[PDB]
Design a binder for these strands. Sequence first.
DNA 1: CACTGGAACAGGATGTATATATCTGACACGTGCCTGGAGACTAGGGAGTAATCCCCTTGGCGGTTAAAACGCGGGGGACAGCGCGTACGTGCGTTTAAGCGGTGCTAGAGCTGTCTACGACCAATTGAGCGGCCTCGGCACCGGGATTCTCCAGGGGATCGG
DNA 2: CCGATCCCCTGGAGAATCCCGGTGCCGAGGCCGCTCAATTGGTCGTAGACAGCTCTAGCACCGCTTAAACGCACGTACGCGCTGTCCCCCGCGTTTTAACCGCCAAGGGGATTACTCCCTAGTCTCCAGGCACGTGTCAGATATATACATCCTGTTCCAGTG
Lengths: 71, 98, 95, 74, 102, 84, 82, 101, 107, 107, 93, 93, 40
Amino acid sequence: PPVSELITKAVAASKERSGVSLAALKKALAAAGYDVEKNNSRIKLGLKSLVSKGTLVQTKGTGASGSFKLN
Amino acid sequence: KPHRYRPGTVALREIRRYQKSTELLIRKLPFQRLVREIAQDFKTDLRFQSSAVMALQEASEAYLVALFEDTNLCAIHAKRVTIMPKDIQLARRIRGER
Amino acid sequence: RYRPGTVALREIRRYQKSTELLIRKLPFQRLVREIAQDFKTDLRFQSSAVMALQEASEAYLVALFEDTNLCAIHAKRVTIMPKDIQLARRIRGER
Amino acid sequence: MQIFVKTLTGKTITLEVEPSDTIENVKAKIQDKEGIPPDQQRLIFAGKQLEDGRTLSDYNIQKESTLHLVLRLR
Amino acid sequence: MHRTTRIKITELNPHLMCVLCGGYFIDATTIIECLHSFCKTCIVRYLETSKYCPICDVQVHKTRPLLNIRSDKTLQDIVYKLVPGLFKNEMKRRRDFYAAHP
Amino acid sequence: HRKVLRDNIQGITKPAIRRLARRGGVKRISGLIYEETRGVLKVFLENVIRDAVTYTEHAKRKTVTAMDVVYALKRQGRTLYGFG
Amino acid sequence: VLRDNIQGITKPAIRRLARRGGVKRISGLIYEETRGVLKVFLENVIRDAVTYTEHAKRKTVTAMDVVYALKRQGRTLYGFGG
Amino acid sequence: KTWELSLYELQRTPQEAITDGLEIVVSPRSLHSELMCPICLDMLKNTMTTKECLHRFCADCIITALRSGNKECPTCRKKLVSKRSLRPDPNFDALISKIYP
Amino acid sequence: AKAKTRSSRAGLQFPVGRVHRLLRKGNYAERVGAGAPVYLAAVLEYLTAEILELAGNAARDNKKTRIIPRHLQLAVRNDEELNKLLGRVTIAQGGVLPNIQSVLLPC
Amino acid sequence: AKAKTRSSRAGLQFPVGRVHRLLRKGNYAERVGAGAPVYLAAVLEYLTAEILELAGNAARDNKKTRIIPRHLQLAVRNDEELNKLLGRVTIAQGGVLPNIQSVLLPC
Amino acid sequence: TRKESYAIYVYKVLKQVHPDTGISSKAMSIMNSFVNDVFERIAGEASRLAHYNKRSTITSREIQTAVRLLLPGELAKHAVSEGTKAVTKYTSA
Amino acid sequence: TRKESYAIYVYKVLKQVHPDTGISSKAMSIMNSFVNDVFERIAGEASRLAHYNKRSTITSREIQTAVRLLLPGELAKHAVSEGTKAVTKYTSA
Amino acid sequence: GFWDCSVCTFRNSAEAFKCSICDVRKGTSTRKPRINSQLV
DNA sequence: CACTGGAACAGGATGTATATATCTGACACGTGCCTGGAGACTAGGGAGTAATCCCCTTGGCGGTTAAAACGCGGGGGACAGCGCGTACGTGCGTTTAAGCGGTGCTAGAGCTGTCTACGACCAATTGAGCGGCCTCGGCACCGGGATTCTCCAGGGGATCGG
DNA sequence: CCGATCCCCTGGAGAATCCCGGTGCCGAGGCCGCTCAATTGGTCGTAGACAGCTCTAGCACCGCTTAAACGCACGTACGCGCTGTCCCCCGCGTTTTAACCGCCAAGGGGATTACTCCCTAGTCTCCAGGCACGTGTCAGATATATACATCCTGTTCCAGTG
Ligand SMILES: [Zn+2]
Ligand SMILES: [Zn+2]
Ligand SMILES: [Zn+2]
Ligand SMILES: [Zn+2]
Ligand SMILES: [Zn+2]
């Protein structure tokens, strides 16, 4: 499936006091099974898309860094 | 909850004490046995005056202290506070002993 | 046009394969005379003496540059900066 | 009148003061002109440290005199 | 491509016996300071009483000549192939000696 | 002989190396510094002892003297004061 | 008076020396640092050479004097005699 | 250490020499691995043997290999500093000349 | 006539005669002059006086009255020219000059 | 009797007589033994032969028939023991060994 | 047997400089070694100068040049002044 | 005025080792300087040893000890072998 | 009596052997100390 | 079915190693000569050898701690990934001065003769400095206050959500 | 307009370290005898300081050619924060082990003394080994043409998404 619902699952997995960090979501995707090595640009553009659409907002960092949390 | 000092304080205190002191730090008997170990290779049934092993210990301690100072400078230059074998190797290579 | 680095590597190979001097003779001679002017007045210099001075200076500079390159590389960079030279001289014992 | 102050870095500064001016005013002026905190400044002339509340006349400072400024971090 | 040669073992014998025992090289060991080869037992027995080479009297080492001896596997294989049945004979002696003291 | 002295290079204890580093001005020490220091000290002692033994053997004696050790250190460029 | 003779040690010359040393990338202050280092080295060597020739009751510095100065400083040089 | 004689090695008996007049028949490949130069892949000539690993090479072969670079043993990768780490082998030279004149 | 020492002639404390004897038997040259031992003794005396003055100042800084290798090392390593002269010499029981890298200190 | 040179007597090429004279006039000691010059001449000859052989090998590799300072520098620097012996010596017109730090090599 | 040293002379200098300070045995050994080292360095330099200049005599001029080569800066300057003063006093006396 | 050098001896050694190879003037001067430097080092060490043991003679034993002190490892071993063989050959004639 | 420090000209007492302000070691009769602690 | 990117490939420009002709200046060899090395021979002192003394090194035994070794909990520093923006490499067109070849002059390095003062060598002598002995005061070690330096809990203070 | 969450401030308990006064012990400093080397006084030989002369190599100046340095425009890749994870030294308490100190006993070899002999310095005569100088020839630098290896960018193909 396209990475959208996997990203939703990753962000919904913890939903802790702060947002999930970029390294944490990469680790979760790798554990679930995915080639995050060659999809750095794909995950970056997905992050851009789901911060543009307002589904998930960025907590503290800028660009692809920092933490993310659901709306 | 007992008393605990945060990391670094005891290190600084020991640094001050050992820089203010002047006594030897390595133990006489182990150093003597190591000296006899090394000397055993060249000749057999040698004997050592006590002043000889004292001088050897003095020279070894001075050399190690200087090497550690240069190692600390290298580690600081590398933007760290922990000394490492890479720092020791770089210091010795630049000094010209290897 | 070439990307940065190619000409640098080519010049490194070229100058490591050759043995000629790299500093201009007349400027080096004028520098030597000016430096020596402060110690004694109306001196004279032999051409062999000037050449020996230049050879020694070039060898010392090349050795110091190799040391500063090692220091800079240890610093996890590829660009040399004055602090590298300063640390190299400090460890060598010249400062 | 004009006087001079010499620093440990080889820098010489000039000040416009009067014999009736106090040391507090002088350190206020060096604050104004170079930004150095008055607390870290120690003034020296005739081998003697100047006091905070005294005047320049009390030390018999004349025109074009040169003080010595020392900085110690607090 | 060379041919197959039939030659005197008597003509080759000179460069194959250990001078300490007089017999063929068995588990050869060589001192490296003069590159001299003998039997391992022969040379180790010699080195417990003297510090010079049996042939040219060159000092093997200043203190511990046991540090300057190396096994010559190539020489042992060459002498094994040259001498017919030597390896089988030695294997038989080993089994016979081991069959009595276990 | 008296004994085949062996495994004595570890005489320098980790605390001793730490004390030397503290005197040198070191705050934080990794785990491999101990092995590296032991190797360096062994090399230094080997060189100096070889020089001193050469002097003593040339002197036709059987006791290594502080004078010979001082001379070896001077030969290596490590001039030492306090022992004649 | 001879002035601004250190500026004769040019940036391309320093670049060539660094290239022979194996340097790929050079900052902007390395040139000034190198000029200072070279000036100090030359000052020391020239002082020793001048002392030697002054003792020799001469007025021309020779390659033998330069070689002796370098030997004293620990930088023995071969090829020019001695 | 690593040289203490075993129980058999304490009293092993010498092997008698064969004085019988018989001939040895050898193919050109029987001693190939023992007489082939590791570098030029041919027979040895002016054999040079390393002091540390007792490995045999041609003099020119090993000298060129060391001069080119990688100052280690071409066979077991053990380092050797210079020519002084090798020795000539007249025994090997004589044996080779006898076997294949 | 009563004998007067060359040290008394030159107003020096050091043994000019002993220095002359050492120079003669030191195998330095075929012959030696007259003023060379006096000059060498004067230089040695000046160096010794400077070193002893610095060491005594360092010793009295610690409210003690005996010079020790610690005070000697302190003075030698604190004097720039003396340290440059004695850069490659080790002093027994001398210790190390106390200094701390600023980055290592808390701020 | 016909004169026979001491160098030929010892089977050497170097001037044993000149070495003996230099040992006399160098103020090294009061007396110099007869066997001393032979040893020194032999040692000097051995070192010269070694360095010349290495230089000749380098020159033959470079397809030339004359030894130059570049060949001498290559021979000295490519041998560990000779490099240690001459570590503090600068050879005029020698250049440096071709060596590039690996990480500077573009991957 | 006799073993000569510089202990009494260094003690005299110490009494000229600091009239109330004493010296320990180890410091005495340190100072003796320092004097010996400086003496041998200067003598070696003077001998080398004389050999270079094809001379057979060590003189005050050679000692002066050796001191100038060895001692750094102000130390060399003051040493030269002291030596010249002592030599001229010895000659004029 | 004659100025002596080791040119002829170095050339003879070069012809002994490599029959068909020549040498230039700069390399000749380099070899001359190298020989002089090694000679001075060995002679200085031997003289120091002779003074050190309270003796007034420099002999083959002193030269051997100096060579072993200076040359590293295999170079020292081969130099010692050459010196001993040369001395034996010279004295047995 | 008192002595004047070269670094800062302060009239320092005889009993002290470190300067009160700039904390530089006192120098010898002939050679006076020089610039120390270049940073202010 | 219409967008993107990332790996793969091919031709053009560039640089470098390879094959010949040349002409020339430095290397290799031959010659005369003079100074330094070799052969004989004598004398005296340094070093080798043998005997003896006693200073200091090695080896062993027992207690007493002081230091070393091991394990545990946790916080802070090393390391990897990411983004930005500024300094540095590259190429072009213009300006500068270094290198070459020649002339002219003369200050000074280098060699030679002389002659005088300075340093080595030798005897007689006497006083400074080294070895031995001893004794008393500065310094090492002890214990008790007093003082300075860390570290954590409690407490105000600004701020988002509700 | 209050919860609660992070950020700055202060007080007090607790451990380290300085300052003062006592006590004891050993080595630093001063004194006595003697002996050997530094002084004084003389003679003799040559090392070098001085003056003269010669010629060579260093300094100064000119004009031409062209290679190198300078200044500028432009793009890109590398250094420098910033964040986040995790793991590995650090501080401390409990067990254990061997270094230190004091004491003894044996004897090995370092240090000293007397004797002697042969090895090297010193001197003279004789001669050939090596050094300065001259000259011819080919090793090698330079110029020119050519083939091969590197490098770079444009295009193309296959795999993602919307
Ligand atoms: Zn056998
Ligand atoms: Zn052998
Ligand atoms: Zn081969
Ligand atoms: Zn091998
Ligand atoms: Zn001050």
